[PDB]
Amino acid sequence: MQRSPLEKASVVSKLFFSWTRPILRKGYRQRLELSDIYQIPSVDSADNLSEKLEREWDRELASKKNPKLINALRRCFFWRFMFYGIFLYLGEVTKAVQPLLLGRIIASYDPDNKEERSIAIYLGIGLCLLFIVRTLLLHPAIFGLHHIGMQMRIAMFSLIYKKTLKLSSRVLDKISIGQLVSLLSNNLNKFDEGLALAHFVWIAPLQVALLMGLIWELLQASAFCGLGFLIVLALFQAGLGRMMMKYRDQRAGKISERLVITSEMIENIQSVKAYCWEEAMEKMIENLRQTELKLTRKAAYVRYFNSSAFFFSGFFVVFLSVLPYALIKGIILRKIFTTISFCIVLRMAVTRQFPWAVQTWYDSLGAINKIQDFLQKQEYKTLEYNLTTTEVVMENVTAFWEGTPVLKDINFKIERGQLLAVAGSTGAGKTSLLMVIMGELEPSEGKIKHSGRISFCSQFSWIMPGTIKENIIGVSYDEYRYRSVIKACQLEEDISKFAEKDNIVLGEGGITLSGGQRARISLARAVYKDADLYLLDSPFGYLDVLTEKEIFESCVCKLMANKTRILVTSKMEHLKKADKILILHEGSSYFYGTFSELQNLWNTYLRYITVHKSLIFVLIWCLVIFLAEVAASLVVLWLLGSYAVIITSTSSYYVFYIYVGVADTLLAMGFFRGLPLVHTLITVSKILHHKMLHSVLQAPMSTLNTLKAGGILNRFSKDIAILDDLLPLTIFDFIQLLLIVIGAIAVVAVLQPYIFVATVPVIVAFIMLRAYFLQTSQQLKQLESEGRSPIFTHLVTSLKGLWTLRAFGRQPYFETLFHKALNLHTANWFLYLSTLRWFQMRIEMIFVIFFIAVTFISILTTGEGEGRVGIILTLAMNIMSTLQWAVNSSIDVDSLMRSVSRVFKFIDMPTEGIWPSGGQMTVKDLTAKYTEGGNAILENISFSISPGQRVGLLGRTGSGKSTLLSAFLRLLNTEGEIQIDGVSWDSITLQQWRKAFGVIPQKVFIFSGTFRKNLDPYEQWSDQEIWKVADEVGLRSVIEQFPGKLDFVLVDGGCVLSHGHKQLMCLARSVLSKAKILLLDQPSAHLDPVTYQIIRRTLKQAFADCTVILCEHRIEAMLECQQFLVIEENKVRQYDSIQKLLNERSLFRQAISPSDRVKLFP
């Protein structure tokens, strides 16, 4: 990693941006290697910028009664902002006085203008120095303003993230992931470049005042007829600005709603494929896209009229200011041309630079105001204590999640070292009681007293990205303690089977790990941490009886025999070792005491154009009208080769100069060509998104596991927004400029076939430099686009584990990890702007040297009369002033076309592509593996199932019970044959095979939507049928407690529901879509014994005969099975009776609960 070459560059080197030479010469030959990227300058590191802004923002909250974020920003950047403003202003004044020097030089070709001929050589020298000063004064000032805008964005992004970790739990309900992503993505590039346009709010009015005086000198009182037209045009554009912003505000809410739904369905794409819900998911996104595209089109029509206003004023402001003057007294051709030159600069300031500057202030101040509101939300109240009486106590505590209280009159007292066991039915408030103790649920009544040290283990196991060892140890590594908790948590057997022991890298969310393996990593993390109080929220959910027995008798009873701890349990064996017993029932304390007293009872462009058939026809239509206007202009112009206009023989060359000055209005695209072009370019974006979303759902699971959450969110938010807003109008601007250059050249090249010869050397010089620069610019843009992903990936994972983050105190670690993501994007983005500034500065210096040669050639060639060389050469250089604008606009088109190629890569991803009368199956030599180069988890598996019977799957956690179920649906690489009632595996299409199954996934899927929409996304059942099923699974009381019965919206993945309520929701789905063969993957994970009767009755009534393959861990669930399959060391054994199964195993028979042993062994 080399140091930045900017920090030791000489004064002249910084001026010409010469320090970018090493990378431009290397990127032209080879691909940019990882060592070519330089380190960022020390001034713009995220650590130093965040501290500077934080110091000023805290001064506002204490000094001023009315804090404003814009005052803190003003106190850090105002003087540098104004320093570059004055140099930018002097570069624009130089542009307005150019016609004073160039206008008199053009007059020296006329032999009548004897006064201009005597001093022509001095005007040429001054003109050359004027060009050089303007070049050296604009570009360094524009780069400095880009630098300031980058620093402001980095400082403010870090403040948002630091505030996020401190948000209260009540205000988290009102904030989704889609709001934060839209807040950051919209400003990721627009904010930096906005500061270069901000100064024209006061530069444009000063340019108008200067230019109006010079035009007054020529046309005494007729000049104001041109000002009255431009004032009316300025009011018109101001009105279109407010009309466009109204449509943009109505569109923001729908984009955030689409982003959250898109993120949810891709995170659990395996559950979507098992249910065969791809078509239903596409329909929901299609309806959201359609509503927001109508607002996008309406904003596009308004923005077209705002953009073409420049081209449609070039003739009507010149004509209106000259016509009253010519009618009273004849005007010569010399004055007509000079007025045209001054009006070009005037139209640019009024119709282009000023409305763009006003719009930037609306966007910038709007975002800073939006950020300030977020920075003032309610914060989490960390009620830490340094010390206590070493005992925990609650007194008459009542809490509300908002007409029923969650808890009421809950009181206990646990001394140091005692064990408290919390028990109760589903939804009784066991998890809420632990939230109250930690302080994430503030009680309305009562009080809490205990020490500030605490450790937590939730039902939902959160796995941070990184190594397994890094998950457990935290910050401080201890060799002795680490090896003890691993052995006590029974993780040694699983770790030894991994490719590289405990050094394997876990993805975000821990997808590659088993259901029960994640629970042990979460538990090992809690016991490794030293604390005074330990909270365990049902950690024995996805564990078999043998592993559960070993952990309970060696981890929580041996290692922590002297530490007070609270555990949630439903087993009656865990209640005997507890000193205190607490029973909960619907928020009220059912019992409190002890157990003893209880026992008393390029190809990219071509593909983009041809994706929509209607885009070709509009482009041909624009070409035919263009040829008709050029032909019309040629006939008129050829016809011209006291009066209102005075023209002489030696002054007739002004006709061509006037034509070139008004060609931008004769060739302007009217609304018959502008609106269809803009309308059709948005339909292309609609088609591309439909394909992109479609190909992601059909991709094979092996491909989808490589992608990251931030990688998908980068393409669906930033790349789609580019194709909707920026590209349609950038293309229109580029096409408009290209037509003007061709039309002006073609007309004058046939009437004077020497302008074309003299304009060749300038054209090829621009094209050769463009090809050289695009070799390296395209690679830096690609690296910058992919550098946004780590920013989005870290933002997603920090919200999913916010509660665990604050409990373990790892906030500083996550802030430092966020700054590395900011610095990685800064390196690529800063290097991209530097080379872009080099190109635009060289494209202007190349224009200058040619003009310097032309000016001196014309003056020396002009002899005693006329002088034709100068007339031709100076005309050609006037055309190249517009070609310079067209070349720079082509770079913007190419930069935005990088998003089109990134979308095309997601589209080209490979695809994975009464029969069951009885439902009997046959498996022959099935071999299953996740990666083709990985180990075979199962191998040579073979068994048969008779129709109507139930099969029980058994085995230790991590043995491969879920792998066998995934192999039936072909969710991984398989090498065998499965036969269902006669048909063959291979012959069937992959879509009819999956429809024969009913599935209950181990990980439940609830998306943001209505209760009825979650139970039935295809809308194929009436509400009478839905309620009938809802009674059989006991969900009626759950739905009625909400304001909308079957209408309530389940936001944030159904966070309103408890853990046991989600299991019943998945059982309802399987009953509704009644199929023959069922694959139930542990449907009673955390259900208490009383609630399990609901699963038991459903299994015998709803699934009358069927072919049920259970995958349960509880012994009670195996009394309803006729056949058994045991998975051990990658092999499947088969048994006919449960009593035979336990006879062979000696250790597993002892772990059986005595309550279950009597019925298992009568």
Ligand SMILES: Cc1nn(C)cc1S(=O)(=O)NC(=O)c1ccc(-n2ccc(OCC(C)(C)C(F)(F)F)n2)nc1N1C[C@@H](C)CC1(C)C
């Ligand atoms: C080497 C090198 N390679 N790369 C990638 C960067 C570098 S460089 O930064 O060292 N220099 C150059 O980049 C460089 C510097 C100046 C110029 N100039 C062109 C006209 C001109 O007159 C200046 C003028 C008299 C108008 C005045 F002074 F008045 F303005 N100067 N051209 C330069 N280029 C080198 C080639 C890459 C292509 C080319 C010809 C455009």
Ligand SMILES: CC(C)(CO)c1cc2cc(NC(=O)C3(c4ccc5c(c4)OC(F)(F)O5)CC3)c(F)cc2n1C[C@@H](O)CO
């Ligand atoms: C002196 C006085 C006339 C009033 O005492 C004044 C100065 C001033 C400066 C800024 N902003 C800036 O100096 C910066 C800036 C921020 C945001 C940007 C950006 C530049 O340019 C953008 F448009 F891109 O957005 C560099 C930080 C402002 F906002 C309002 C200001 N006012 C009016 C006053 O009422 C403000 O309280």
Ligand SMILES: Nc1ncnc2c1ncn2[C@@H]1O[C@H](COP(=O)(O)OP(=O)(O)OP(=O)(O)O)[C@@H](O)[C@H]1O
């Ligand atoms: N964020 C929330 N907003 C509103 N109600 C909630 C919220 N979280 C939980 N509830 C409700 O509070 C009650 C108790 O919550 P819950 O976590 O606490 O039960 P539990 O004892 O953990 O049961 P389980 O065995 O399913 O884990 C339920 O009726 C549940 O729907």
Ligand SMILES: Nc1ncnc2c1ncn2[C@@H]1O[C@H](COP(=O)(O)OP(=O)(O)OP(=O)(O)O)[C@@H](O)[C@H]1O
């Ligand atoms: N996507 C994956 N890629 C690679 N290995 C995986 C993947 N998913 C699981 N494994 C590994 O395969 C083995 C078996 O996985 P697992 O689902 O299949 O078993 P299980 O019997 O369902 O466990 P549990 O009772 O915890 O649910 C484990 O070692 C696990 O880490």
Ligand SMILES: CC(C)(C)c1cc(C(C)(C)C)c(NC(=O)c2c[nH]c3ccccc3c2=O)cc1O
């Ligand atoms: C009738 C005919 C010849 C097809 C026609 C008509 C117009 C109107 C009537 C809208 C002026 C226009 N005008 C336009 O397209 C205009 C486009 N952009 C503008 C921007 C600012 C101010 C005016 C216009 C404008 O008139 C063009 C035409 O070709």
Ligand SMILES: CC(C)CCC[C@@H](C)[C@H]1CC[C@H]2[C@@H]3CC=C4C[C@@H](O)CC[C@]4(C)[C@H]3CC[C@]12C
């Ligand atoms: C940037 C701004 C403040 C610069 C100064 C703006 C004003 C004061 C300048 C700009 C152009 C100037 C005019 C240019 C030409 C003439 C013609 C001359 O026969 C009388 C003075 C007169 C009419 C000038 C008056 C002052 C003037 C209107």
Ligand SMILES: CCCCCCCCCCCC
């Ligand atoms: C350099 C430009 C400073 C003034 C720009 C506008 C100031 C913000 C006004 C806020 C609303 C009254």
Ligand SMILES: [Mg+2]
């Ligand atoms: Mg719970």
Ligand SMILES: [Mg+2]
């Ligand atoms: Mg499993």
